[PDB]
Amino acid sequence: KLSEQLKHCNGILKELLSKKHAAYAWPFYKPVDASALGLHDYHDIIKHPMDLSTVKRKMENRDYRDAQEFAADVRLMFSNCYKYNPPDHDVVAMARKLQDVFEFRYAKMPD
Template sequence: MADQAVRTGLTVITDQIRTQLIKVIDQTKKLRNYGSVFADPVDYISLGLNDYLEVIKRPMDLSTLRSNIMGAEYTYLHQFIKDADLIWSNCRVYNGVQSESFFLKAADECEKAFISLLCRIEQLQLTPEQHRIILQNPIPVISSDDEGPMSILQLHFLSKKLADLPREAQIQCVKWYYKQLGVNEDVDQYKDKDIRLVFKPSDSKVTRELDKLVTRKLDETRQLQKVTKV
């Protein structure tokens, strides 16, 4: 069972599977009485939850999960499943599992519905037991060398994320990229121009690392913007 769960967890998220996962998210959002609770990020500022980010280290919600899957943030099913679980587990951590609050009831009902919908996707052949095993056990890490070239969709979203970065962060990422490739490129020339990168299949390892760097920089930028608004 454990071996099969690992194999299922390592299912590559194809465009067809991505479409089905998006449907699962959208259907969970519509769950009567409870779906709306987790539809969007917790507005901890308006709610006066001043300690929220101290308690919850990695916030997650259905809209963010949807954006991530749309943006090809997940290569494997187990990555998607573990991020989705943060939605329910964060709720339980912040509210306390011993309480009988509406929010814990919402977490239980949404999680149950989400898993049920997920297990109905024929391409996955996922069972509730496999889902539990995937959550409770680390999945072997596949190195960038073994992952192969990024898909056209993944490269598209990498370019979009890079474009969303502040100019200084863009320059830093591009400098890092060319340095890893051993290319002597005058990156400063892009300060007043659009940055255009050409991705080659032979550079897939470096390209995947660039994607991680850009994602991290974008997360840092968004967190800084939230703090600034406060």
């Protein structure tokens, strides 16, 4: 069902949800619950929410055309966090740490 490149991507997904990175990955596991957090303007500012559970749903449903589309969704997750938050926010620090893991593994993708 999966190309060599999308298997590599599924392995990155597994890595990003693994306990090793939980200290900083956890705000990305589920969709941002704007009402529960009191972020009443989140969905006015962030037009296309993304999180690791959405990515995992897509991967399980074979919805990614290619590894580039997978990378676009993971990068959107991070970009939404940088767009909504100020630069010194604790969740932005977490996003940068998780994104370092993502980009490094993504770069080792096979030809």
